[PDB]
Amino acid sequence: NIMMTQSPSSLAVSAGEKVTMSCKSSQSVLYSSNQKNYLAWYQQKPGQSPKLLIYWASTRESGVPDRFTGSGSGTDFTLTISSVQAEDLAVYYCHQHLSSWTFGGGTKLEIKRADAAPTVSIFPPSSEQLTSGGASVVCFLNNFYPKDINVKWKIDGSERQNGVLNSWTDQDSKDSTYSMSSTLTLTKDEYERHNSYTCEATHATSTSPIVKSFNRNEC
């Protein structure tokens, strides 16, 4: 058939940088009879369906910002974003429609920005959950950068990473930050035999964490 290969698989740049991503087809997608390249580009933002950006290799779809330019011919194609904006984080796919319909594997565009400390919030298990024999301790780390933050749980001053469920949001399309939730799963018995519970957040870069704590014995 016709296979589409995209590169790079992912890249990160700061707002204001130019990016060129590539798409190669295993056969020519230039239709002999009208000399059009049957090559399209799609943008797929978090939680959304793909959206058409470019068709016939180089024609911008109505409504699409001028910073997106498609180029190339035959087997060799590129999509350029002249100056990346925060809202451009997405997976970008190329597509051919000359011989059946196939898609590339995608290029994931992430945004770089200045480091940002998380706003950290810790929550004791609710009495509702406790009466039921479970104890989930939740910590939110909101609006931080970069993505790869470390979360550590300390119980009575000593670490436990056993039983921790971590979930990151997709990057924010406006301020380029991430947020994550960290849930410490304990049995009620485990919870009731310790008192101090601490969630610590540290950039891999430093040794200055943000900590939030509570005591079970208090309230």
């Binding site: 369906s49 068709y55 597509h95 059946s100 989930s136 979930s167 990151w168 509570f214």
Partner: protein
Amino acid sequence: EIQLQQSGAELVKPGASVKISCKASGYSFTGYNMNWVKQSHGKSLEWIGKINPYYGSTSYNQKFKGQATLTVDKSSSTAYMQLNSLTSEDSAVYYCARGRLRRGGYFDYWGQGTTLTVSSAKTTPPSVYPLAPGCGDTTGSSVTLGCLVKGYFPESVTVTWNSGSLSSSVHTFPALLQSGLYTMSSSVTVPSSTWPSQTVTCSVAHPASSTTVDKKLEPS
């Protein structure tokens, strides 16, 4: 404005069939091909097949030819994709997409997607826990509250915050699967001058289990 409105998320068992709909509006339904596309979690897009609504003529990716059936109803301008003999590898998001036949057939408008889960795991309602700060805590100019939504299946769920006339910042944390059950959480941040004075409620709808739970956040 063109809209392609797909049916809601489905959970079906291995070996069973499913029929997903795509209702078209804002253009000549009969004028344009309707395509279907699979996206597995991981994210490669694969074309499944297409139908020409005027004739009812179809064309399929040979990888899907045997299990997929495309039809239309031109009384409701709706396209359908039926998939039969389902397996877990068929769990994916499915899209309908309009094709531009006379420009070579690229896709120009997409539906919102329909999530298909193929599994023998049982439909299970969520437990909902409100997350309020402890009595030992303090807050600055803002306060963050949360909702933990635990132990439900299948994935389709909506967590809605009502903070009344307050403006808020919400974060929704993607669900994680454990033992065939999902757990997710959501946070809401409002000014500290406004909570607990004003009511903040987490509303959780899980259609599959006919569950709608509302939990008001109360000071500890």
